[PDB]
Each structure stands twice: as structure tokens, then as C-alpha cells.
Design a binder for this molecule. Structure first.
Ligand SMILES: C[C@@H]1NC(=O)N[C@@H]1CCCCCC(=O)O
Ligand SMILES: C[C@@H]1NC(=O)N[C@@H]1CCCCCC(=O)O
Ligand SMILES: [Gd]
Ligand SMILES: [Gd]
Lengths: 594, 594
């Protein structure tokens, strides 16, 4: 039923065969005299494959038995080429085991016998899986780079190790170094592998991308390797001049911004689930980038698009507060008086006196809903909430408006259930537009509550109004007109009014549902306020409160750059073509030092 | 559409012209042989202005190319005098670039050729703007002082550098040092520039004020430079005697207190938006000052003025609780019974039995409102809330009282809307008078809540009473008389009473507005209490809670010293005239050392 049990069963099974096979046992214990008393007379199987398809040399290489390994090579030099014939270690040679163990003399001897420096260890243990503690790759050169042994690295290059070699996952020796825990020390090894590159501008090793379309520089950002990212940044920044403390450095800004449909560091950071990758935006070439993208273009277009959405939702409620109308007509208010409806449905509701003002208003609510779907539906085909569930709500709001239209033209009785959902989904999606020390942050987070509060009540008071605009105000008239309805709901937002409560009669199916959602949102905002009031002052967790919002702003800034056309929102940085720099866009960033 | 893009475009444009111009390129790369192969045959333009109006020497000075700069000076000595003819660096000479780079040999050579030590670099990059990383000034002497190179400082003084020189912003070399980040090291440079002063008591360099009326000593306080402030304080304090550990030092206390209409350190600290400047009050010459100003004179006059305001507001409500009276008269309570008013308006309300007791009370409410305007309106002409929005509320309260008077004499029906606003604005402005370890601070902040609570209810219960004194107590009688009204509102302050809630009838326009403000203030005080209960115990943020109140007390102490006459509130410190000290007021401060 599992897999980890198998390899745990095999390692125990391996030590069994070593304990049984006297050749393998002598290769483990480095019993030199027992190898001569076994290989010359009475010759035993020397190509003896153990439990993991290992030769006697593989066991002599696992335990760094140089004396025992040299006897196994002089009596049978063909053991050097032999790889592990198992499934867990398919491809691993005696050289791979000697490289990771940093056995320079055994590596020197294995290379002297002519070991393959291009052997791919494609075994299941060497995979990049969470159940494998190390990921070094496949080639023995890739092993030497990860163990930090610069001596074996160059010693393998001298015997024809291809640095351009990629594993099953399309990772070069450079990609794998970035996926190593020792970040500060891998920078030293990374520069060693680069020195053996072809030296030509074309076919560079740092440009060879991952199988998932990630150059090593780009992979460092997505993986959140801060030390590798800053190191690789040194090779793509030019210091313009030195003016005392000022150091105007010109950054590359090539693989850090968008033209790639999906290839761009910014998009890969805001859409990845990796918590460590969020720190990459904050680096000295990137933090200047998104800060310029939000000060200009970003913030104004977000509030311009906001004011357009505030007007589009207040118009939808303008057509709801004055919904269509005939009183009950039916005597159904006499039997089963528990239902006191004065239901209102309307078809030749063409009769126009002030009804065309709402009709053109209802037409705005329709043409705006399809436009919402014309910018979100073609976008789902090409989904990570960093930046708020605004997209999940904006598509379900337009769905309720279309259902209300489908509700219309058929004269259905349940015209309230799909229309009321659009009121809360339309308003509470406005509070997402709130993206525009402990003192001002308490006040800063308090203004988010004051914005999120007034938005919630304006969506539930308009809802509760429709829920009891048809019903009778004789009993339970908490929302008999709009001005009240807002005031009742506002007090209901603080639990001052006892909640529309009535059990003699019955009240529509939507009140027992809409009021249930209103009671939960009211406490979560008041719980999120307390955390915004205490979490802001407790400790520097206000920073943790802080870059989550900053990352939400960066995630929103990248969102506004995808759908907006090229005529608006010009490209960041400065193009290089005349003034001479080759048509990449560079960012001029200067810093003072103290 | 921006400006930072331009200079980013120009620096890229600069490197283009350097890359193109072989003379400028040779000046950058220090190509000595390429300068001789360009200047002697085949002579090229040597006065070649680059992209930023720079000469070949300016480029040879930017990159510290001494060998290349000396060839450009021997073949064309007129390049030394030439300044940058650009807009970004208008005025910068080859000496300015050699001073900041601390190139002593190039500075020695430029001075030997006779470079202007008084050249003002008035370029746009050298401005004191937030988009400029450094502000050093204009003169090359001011550059040497900011880079900490005391060798170039004296070397420039030897060639006639004027220390008395001011930039466009009227800043001497001393003002600029205070605006430098390296505070601990600028104190060393500051004493060097003072040694070259005229040595005369008159025309001292430390007395030359800013263009915005700030001596360097005064600027250190407004800017919050603690290291410079304590350093400059050493020269204006005299140790009276040494008595073992005791060291009675006599402080100057001249530029730290008021006679200057607006010139005084205290006023400049409490009115500036700079958060760092608040720490200056707390220094050892200033913290003793405001502490003496608040123990005596400050605290008593604040509570005396408080008790006068408590009586002035309780008298205004005394005339409201017994407002004027005729019942409805009209049959309008029969049709549209939704309005159950028993409206009360009165003109020959002269008829006097107990009505003169209120008339003289109404006369107090008028003569007091104009006095409030006679001490605040002439003060707005000569506005920062540090110390609470008491001034913003005290002027709008007196505005409502005057409107109520204008409401009167015309027999208007809306006599409640402007009168009720004065009840909450009159009381809730009292809680501002609350300025009078974790244990006693929890109790200290709890007594602020107990004071702010009882003040809010006494303003809203009196309001809610007037809102329903005219209305009918048959239905919704939460405030039928004053003793109740207080009790209902008190319970309403804790959300125990369901809130005056009624939907059958209608209730005046002021209840749906006054009760909305009452529900928000009730939760903010209870939210501010929780933070006062947890924030006080969490960590030493109670100190952060702490000096904000202390600064509010200091801001209030300076407020009480401006309007009070000279006969009250004597001047701080002790005058020097006979006993011999020259008519400045000194503060005697002694300290013990351990
Ligand atoms: C010890 C085993 N014997 C052997 O000859 N090779 C194996 C080496 C084990 C390394 C497993 C690496 C991994 O966890 O992926
Ligand atoms: C490098 C430029 N070339 C040059 O000849 N002078 C400039 C010096 C730049 C300093 C900008 C100072 C500031 O940021 O205000
Ligand atoms: Gd009833
Ligand atoms: Gd009744």
C-alpha cells in the first residue's frame, strides 16, 4: 500500500546480501586479504550483483575503501563501467559513489581506468521528489558541484565532463545549484562552472532554460533563493559612474518583466504557491521596478477603474430599490395567512412614465455584466488568489445578473433569490478596492475597516430591503423604505437591533439565508479589526501584516498590466536602442552608502 | 508625464556621448596615450561639451583618473574654470567632482591651476528634494564637509573658501552638516569649520540663520538630530561647580523658549509633522524645561480652565432640558399619523415666571460662545493636531450655538438640528480635558475611559432627550425625562437596550443621525480601551503609548502660554541681569552620576 516501506525493506535486504556474499562483505569491510583469498583461488563471481544491482566495486565505493576498491579494479577492470542494475539506482556508476564521497584518490583511479563522466543516474532515488532528501541530478559532474568539492569538479572537466548536460527535468548543473540548501557556498561553485563555458556570446550556459521554461536566473526567483539571485544579479548590472557615496547602477531588467506571454519573473512570483519566492520582489533591482509601476499608472488606473465600478453597482441597486410592482391581486393572503406576500411581477411593464429611466439603467446592468465576462472568461483559459478573491466574486456577480434577466422574460415568482445575491456580490467586491510605525498603521488598518464596513451594509441593507419590500410592514418593518433599511442594517451590523425576528408569521426564504451571511461577515470584520489593532502593535509582525498587502498590490499591479492595452501603461525602464544598448529595457537605480 | 524618466534617459544619453566622443572616452578610461594621440595631432575639440555639458576634464574627474586629468589640464588649462553647462548640473566645476571623490592630488592640482572655491553648483540634482539621495549644498567647501574629508576642508580654506557661504536655501555649511545621515561623525567636522570663524562675538557662523529662520542649533531640533543637538548644547551650558557626583550645569535656554512670535524651539517641535523631532524635547536641557512648565502653572490652569468649561456646558444643557414649549395646537396628528409631533415653538416666550432663569442662562451660552471665537478665530490667522482636535470642535460648537440663536428670532421649525449638535460637540470636547509599569498605567488608561465614557453619554442622553422630548412617549419613550434618558443611553452605550427602535410610526430626522454617531463612538472607546489594556502590558510600547500623551501635554502647555497674559504664567528659567549674566534666561539643572 506504500512505497517508502519498499525502499526501507530493500536497504535492509541490501545489508543481508552484503552479510551473505563474502565478496560484497569483504568489499564493505575493506578486507584486502579476503579479496585476494577470494579472487585468485577459488575464484568467485566477481561481477556479483548484490541486492541493489551493485557490484563489489559499488560496495567498495559506498564505504570509502580505497585499498579494497583498487584490488577489485586490478583483478576485474570491467567493474568500473558497470552501473547499478537496480530500479532505485538505475544508472549510478562506481564513479558517482566516489564523487559524492569526495574520494579524490578513487576518483583519480576511476578516471584513470576510463570511467564514463557522462553516465546519467536516472534511478528513482535521485528524483526531485519530496521523499528524497537530496537532489543533485544525474551526471557525476553535477554530483561534484553539489558537494562543494571544486577539486573533483575540475578533475571531471579535464576528462571531458559536459557542463551543458541536462537531467531528466531539463536542469543544467546551474539549475541544480540553485536548488541546494547551502546558498552562500553554492555561489562560489557556480562561478567555477561558468569559467569552463564556451566563452562565446551565443550558446551560453546561463541561458539554457529549464524543461519548465526557467533559466537559472529565473529559477532563483521562483524558488526564492536570495543569495543566488543577488549573485546572478551582479553579472546583469552596470555601474554608470562613481560619485562619492552615490553609485548609479544600471540593471538589466530583461528576464524580470513582461513580454513573455507567461515568461516573466513578476508573474511567476505572484502566481506561485512558494512562500519564499515573495521575497524576490523586494530585491534591489525588482523593488524599484514595482514601486514605479504602482506610483504612476498603477494607483490611478486602479481608482479610475474603482470609481467606474462604484457607479456600476450603485446603478444596479438604483434599479432594485425601485423594483417592478403589482400588489398581490390574489386572495391567498386570507388562507394560510402565515404568508403575507404582496407579490409583484410585471410584463407589460413597458408602460413608460419614469420606467424608461430604470430600463436604460437595467440596460447598463446587462452591458456591464457581459463586459465583465468579456475580460474574465477569456482569462480563465490562460488562477491564484494572492491578490484577493475579487475575480471569483466578479464572475459570480455577473452570473446572477444574467440569471435575473433569464428570471425575467419568463415571469417567474422567485425573482428575489438571484437578484439579492447580486447585491452583496456587487458591493462586497468593492471593498477589494481598498488597496489604494504602529500609529498610522492602526489608523491605516482602521480606514480599511471603515471602508469594508460601509460597503457591507450598503449590500445587505439593499438586500434586506428587497427581502421585505414585497412583504408587509405591518409586522417586521425593519426595512420598509431605503433610508430606514440602511439604518436598521447599520445597527444590525453592531448587534444593537435584535435582528429582524418574527415567528408568528413566516418570512421569505432569503431572509433566513442572507441574514446568516450578514451575521458572519459582521463578526469577521470585527475580528479582523481587533487583529489589525493588536497585531499592528505587538511586534514587527506589522511587517508580516505589511508585505502581504504589498504583495497584494504587486499582484494587482501585474493584473492591471495584462488587460490594459499598449497605448496606456507604458513599458517600465528605458529602451536601449539609440542610446546604444541593444534593445533591452534597463532600469536606472542609484543608491547612497553610509 | 514625469521627470525621473528624463534624468534616467540623460544618464543613458551621457554614456552614449562618452562612448561616441573619443576624447570623452579617453578621459573616462584614463587612456593617456590616446589623449596625446588626440590633442597634439590631430587636434580635436578640447572644449568638447558632452551630454551633460561636461568637459573632458569633468569626465576625467568623475572617474578618478589623475593621469588623464593632468594631461587635459596641461594641454588646455581653461578646462578647470569651465562648469557644467547642463540643466541638471548647472554650476558644478571640475573641482566639485574632485572634492566629493576625495581626490587630494587632483584637488591640489585644480587649486594650483586656480580653481574657483566659491563656485555655486545650482543644478537641479543638487537640490534638497526627496528624489535626490544626497544634499551637500552648492560650494566645494560644503562638499568637503559632508564627505568627512577634513583634509580637503582645510585645503580649501587655505585657498580662500568662505565658510560664511550660503546656498539657495540660505543654509550655511553648518546647516547642511545637520541634514547629514552620519550624525556621530558630522560633530567632528562641525568643530573644524567653527575654528576658521572670525573669532569675534559679533557675526558668528552659528548665529547665521536659515532662509526659513532657523539657526543651525535650532535646525537640529526641528530636524530631530539628537547627536548634533547634544553636541551643540555643550557650547551653551556652563558647569556651576563640581561637588562629588553632583554637577550643577547652567543651560542657556535662549533659542529653546518663547518670545519669538513664532521663533522658539518648543513651538517648532510641537507643530512640525516630523516624527523624529519629538525626541528633542526629551533632551537634558529641554526635558527639565517643559516639566517645570507643567507641574506649576500648566496643570492648575488647565484644570481651572477645565472646571470653567464643565460649568459652561452643563449650563447650556440646563437651558435645553427645559426647552420652550406649546403643544402641537395643529390637527396634523390626525392625518399622516406616522408623525406624532407635539412641536414646540415660542416667541412671546417673554412671559416670565421661571423663564428668566433660563434667559440669563441662554445669555451665558451666547457670551461664552463669542469669547471662544474671540480666542480661536484670531488664532487661526496666525494648525497641527498633536494635541487633540479640541480646537476644531470648540469652534464648531460655538458655531451651532450662534446658528441656534439665528434659528431663534425667526421661529423656525428645525430648532433641534443645530441645537443637538452643540450638545455632543460641547460635552465630547470635555473629555479632551483628561490630560490631567503596567499596573497603574492600566488603571491610568482605564480612568481615561471612565472619564471619556461618562462624558459621551452626558452629551448623547441630553441629545436623545431633546430628540424625543417633543415626540410622544406613548410609543418609544426611551427618553421621556432626563433621569431616564441618561439611564437608557448609558445602557445603550453597552448595547444592552435594543436601541430606540420603532418602525410603525416615524421618528425625527435627528435620531437616525445622532444614534449613528453614538454607535460608532461607543465601539471606538471600547476598542481604544482594549488596546489600552493589552498594549500597556505587551511590551515597552506603553512608552510609545506614553510620550505621545507626554507630547500632547507639552503641546497643551505651549497652547496655554500663548493666550494667557504676562501677569499670569511667569517666564521659565532665571533672568541673568544682576546677577550679571546678560539678560538671557538660564535654567539651573543638576544631575547625579553613578
Ligand atoms: C547506500 C546504497 N548502496 C549503494 O550502493 N548505493 C546506495 C546509495 C544511497 C543513496 C540514496 C540517495 C537518495 O536518498 O536519493
Ligand atoms: C555622473 C554625472 N556625470 C558628471 O559629470 N556629473 C554627474 C554626477 C552625478 C551626481 C548626481 C548627484 C545627485 O544625485 O544629486
Ligand atoms: Gd399588530
Ligand atoms: Gd400602545
Amino acid at each position: 500500500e506504500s512505497w517508502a516501506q519498499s525502499r526501507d525493506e530493500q536497504n535492509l535486504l541490501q545489508q543481508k546480501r552484503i552479510w551473505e556474499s563474502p565478496l560484497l562483505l569483504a568489499a564493505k569491510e575493506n578486507n584486502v586479504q579476503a579479496l585476494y583469498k577470494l579472487l585468485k583461488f577459488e575464484g568467485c563471481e566477481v561481477h556479483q550483483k548484490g541486492a541493489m544491482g551493485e557490484t563489489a566495486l559499488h560496495i567498495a565505493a559506498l564505504y570509502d575503501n580505497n585499498e579494497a576498491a583498487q584490488v577489485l579494479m586490478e583483478a576485474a577492470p570491467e567493474l568500473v563501467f558497470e552501473p547499478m542494475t537496480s530500479e532505485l539506482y538505475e544508472g549510478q556508476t562506481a564513479l558517482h559513489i566516489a564523487v559524492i564521497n569526495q574520494n579524490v584518490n578513487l576518483v583519480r583511479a576511476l578516471l584513470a581506468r576510463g570511467a564514463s563522466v557522462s553516465a546519467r543516474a536516472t534511478g528513482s532515488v535521485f528524483h526531485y521528489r519530496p521523499h528524497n532528501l537530496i537532489y543533485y541530478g544525474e551526471h557525476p559532474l553535477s554530483f561534484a558541484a553539489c558537494v562543494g568539492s571544486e577539486e573533483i569538479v575540475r578533475l571531471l572537466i579535464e576528462h571531458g565532463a559536459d557542463i551543458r548536460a541536462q537531467d531528466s527535468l531539463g536542469n543544467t548543473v546551474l539549475h541544480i545549484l540553485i536548488l541546494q540548501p547551502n546558498k552562500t557556498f553554492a555561489c562560489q561553485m557556480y562561478n567555477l562552472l561558468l569559467s569552463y563555458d564556451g566563452g562565446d556570446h551565443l550558446k551560453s550556459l546561463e541561458l539554457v532554460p529549464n524543461n519548465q521554461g526557467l533559466t537559472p536566473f529565473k529559477l532563483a526567483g521562483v524558488e526564492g533563493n536570495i543569495v543566488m539571485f543577488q549573485h546572478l544579479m551582479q553579472k546583469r548590472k552596470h555601474i554608470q559612474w562613481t560619485y562619492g557615496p552615490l553609485t548609479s547602477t544600471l540593471y538589466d531588467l530583461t528576464e524580470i518583466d513582461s513580454s513573455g506571454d507567461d515568461q516573466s519573473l513578476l508573474e511567476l512570483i505572484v502566481t506561485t504557491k512558494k512562500r519564499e519566492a515573495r521575497q524576490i520582489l523586494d530585491q534591489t533591482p525588482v523593488k524599484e521596478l514595482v514601486s514605479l509601476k504602482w506610483k504612476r499608472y498603477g494607483r490611478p488606473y486602479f481608482c479610475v477603474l474603482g470609481a467606474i465600478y462604484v457607479l456600476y453597482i450603485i446603478c444596479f441597486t438604483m434599479c432594485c430599490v425601485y423594483r417592478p410592482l403589482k400588489p398581490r391581486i390574489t386572495n391567498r393572503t386570507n388562507p394560510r395567512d402565515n404568508t403575507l406576500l404582496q407579490q409583484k411581477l410585471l410584463q407589460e411593464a413597458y408602460v413608460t412614465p419614469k420606467d424608461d429611466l430604470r430600463l436604460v439603467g437595467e440596460l447598463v446592468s446587462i452591458v456591464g455584466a457581459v463586459i465583465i465576462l468579456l475580460v474574465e472568461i477569456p482569462d480563465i483559459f490562460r488562477q491564484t488568489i494572492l491578490g484577493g478573491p475579487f475575480h471569483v466574486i466578479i464572475v459570480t456577480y455577473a452570473f446572477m445578473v444574467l440569471v435575473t434577466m433569464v428570471m425575467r422574460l419568463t415571469n417567474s415568482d422567485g425573482e428575489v433569490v438571484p437578484m439579492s445575491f447580486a447585491l452583496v456580490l456587487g458591493w462586497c467586491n468593492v471593498m477589494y478596492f481598498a488597496r489604494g510605525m504602529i500609529q498610522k498603521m492602526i489608523f491605516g488598518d482602521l480606514m480599511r475597516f471603515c471602508w469594508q464596513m460601509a460597503v457591507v451594509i450598503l449590500g445587505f441593507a439593499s438586500a434586506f430591503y428587497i427581502i421585505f419590500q414585497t412583504e408587509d410592514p405591518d409586522e417586521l418593518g425593519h426595512f420598509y423604505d431605503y433610508p430606514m433599511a440602511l439604518f436598521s442594517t447599520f445597527e444590525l451590523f453592531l448587534t444593537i437591533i435584535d435582528g429582524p425576528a418574527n415567528y408568528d408569521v413566516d418570512l421569505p426564504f432569503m431572509y433566513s439565508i442572507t441574514y446568516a451571511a450578514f451575521a458572519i461577515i459582521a463578526t469577521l470584520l470585527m475580528l479582523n479589526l481587533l487583529i489589525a489593532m493588536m497585531g499592528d502593535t505587538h511586534w514587527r509582525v506589522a511587517h508580516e501584516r505589511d508585505e502581504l498587502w504589498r504583495a497584494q498590490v504587486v499582484a494587482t499591479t501585474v493584473m492591471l498590466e495584462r488587460k490594459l492595452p499598449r497605448c496606456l501603461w507604458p513599458r517600465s525602464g528605458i529602451c536601449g536602442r539609440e542610446y546604444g544598448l541593444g534593445d533591452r529595457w534597463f532600469l536606472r537605480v542609484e543608491d547612497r552608502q553610509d
